[PDB]
Design an enzyme around this catalytic site. Structure first.
Site, PDB file in Angstrom:
ATOM      1  N   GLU A   1       0.857  -1.219   0.000  1.00 58.38           N
ATOM      2  CA  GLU A   1       0.000   0.000   0.000  1.00 58.38           C
ATOM      3  C   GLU A   1       0.884   1.257   0.000  1.00 58.38           C
ATOM      4  OE1 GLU A   1      -2.951   0.089  -0.821  1.00 58.38           O
ATOM      5  OE2 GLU A   1      -3.872  -1.820  -0.287  1.00 58.38           O
TER       6      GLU A   1
ATOM      7  N   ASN B   1      -7.565   8.158  -6.105  1.00 56.57           N
ATOM      8  CA  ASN B   1      -8.331   7.071  -6.776  1.00 56.57           C
ATOM      9  C   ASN B   1      -9.039   7.679  -8.009  1.00 56.57           C
ATOM     10  OD1 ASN B   1      -9.070   6.053  -3.413  1.00 56.57           O
ATOM     11  ND2 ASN B   1      -7.518   5.118  -4.724  1.00 56.57           N
TER      12      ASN B   1
ATOM     13  N   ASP C   1     -12.131   7.537  -8.720  1.00 51.61           N
ATOM     14  CA  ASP C   1     -13.457   8.076  -8.306  1.00 51.61           C
ATOM     15  C   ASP C   1     -13.314   9.473  -7.681  1.00 51.61           C
ATOM     16  OD1 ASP C   1     -12.545   7.483  -5.715  1.00 51.61           O
ATOM     17  OD2 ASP C   1     -14.174   6.113  -5.269  1.00 51.61           O
TER      18      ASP C   1
ATOM     19  N   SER D   1     -11.780  10.034  -4.780  1.00 54.82           N
ATOM     20  CA  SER D   1     -11.392   9.816  -3.370  1.00 54.82           C
ATOM     21  C   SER D   1      -9.853   9.766  -3.339  1.00 54.82           C
ATOM     22  CB  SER D   1     -12.039   8.586  -2.766  1.00 54.82           C
ATOM     23  OG  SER D   1     -11.556   7.403  -3.383  1.00 54.82           O
TER      24      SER D   1
ATOM     25  N   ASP E   1      -6.496   7.882  -1.016  1.00 57.55           N
ATOM     26  CA  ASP E   1      -5.990   6.908  -0.021  1.00 57.55           C
ATOM     27  C   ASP E   1      -4.856   7.549   0.788  1.00 57.55           C
ATOM     28  OD1 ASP E   1      -7.817   5.071  -1.022  1.00 57.55           O
ATOM     29  OD2 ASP E   1      -6.288   3.764  -1.934  1.00 57.55           O
TER      30      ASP E   1
ATOM     31  N   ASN F   1      -9.089   5.013   2.571  1.00 60.68           N
ATOM     32  CA  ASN F   1      -9.814   5.730   1.504  1.00 60.68           C
ATOM     33  C   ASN F   1     -10.719   6.786   2.153  1.00 60.68           C
ATOM     34  OD1 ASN F   1     -11.037   6.430  -0.868  1.00 60.68           O
ATOM     35  ND2 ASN F   1     -11.560   4.370  -1.521  1.00 60.68           N
TER      36      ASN F   1
ATOM     37  N   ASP G   1     -15.545  -4.938   8.662  1.00 61.90           N
ATOM     38  CA  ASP G   1     -16.703  -4.465   7.844  1.00 61.90           C
ATOM     39  C   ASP G   1     -17.368  -5.627   7.103  1.00 61.90           C
ATOM     40  OD1 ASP G   1     -18.096  -1.923   7.318  1.00 61.90           O
ATOM     41  OD2 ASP G   1     -17.710  -2.392   5.209  1.00 61.90           O
TER      42      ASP G   1
END
Ligand code: NA
Length: 129
Positions: A35, A46, A48, A50, A52, A59, A101
């Site tokens: 990562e 990202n 979209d 967003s 990280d 995110n 989650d």
């Protein structure tokens, strides 16, 4: 801060990540490697829109607030900047929520693609823990 491999392993263990949700310490260190390359200050945009943040590339779409991710949540109740600190407490606390989650560590695409099923114990090899 760029952590050493065993330095990050020790910090993650201290903060109770070792076998958290049944994921051995090597899984967490492996995820951090791919990562962030163990860099607390790592940020990546990202597709979209967003971003990280930090050692575990948490995110802004769901987990932290950065003020520029429209229609997003802040389920860890933290500014995304808190995930870039030399002190990994906030990243670990938020990672514990992510991995709880329902999809475990598959939440981290790099864990699924690069760590899952591999010899992750190699990542804590030679560490004094
Ligand atoms: Na957000």
């Amino acid at each position: 801060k760029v952590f050493g491999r065993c330095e990050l392993a020790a910090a993650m263990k201290r903060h109770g990540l070792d076998n958290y949700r049944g994921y051995s310490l090597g899984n967490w260190v492996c995820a951090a490697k791919f990562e962030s390359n163990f860099n607390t200050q790592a940020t990546n945009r990202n597709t979209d829109g967003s971003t990280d943040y930090g050692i575990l590339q948490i995110n802004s779409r769901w987990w932290c607030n950065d003020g520029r991710t429209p229609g997003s949540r802040n389920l860890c109740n933290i500014p995304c900047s808190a995930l870039l600190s030399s002190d990994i407490t906030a990243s670990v606390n938020c990672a514990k929520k992510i991995v709880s989650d329902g999809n475990g560590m598959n939440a981290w695409v790099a864990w699924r693609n690069r760590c899952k099923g591999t010899d992750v114990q190699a990542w804590i090899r030679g560490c004094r823990l």
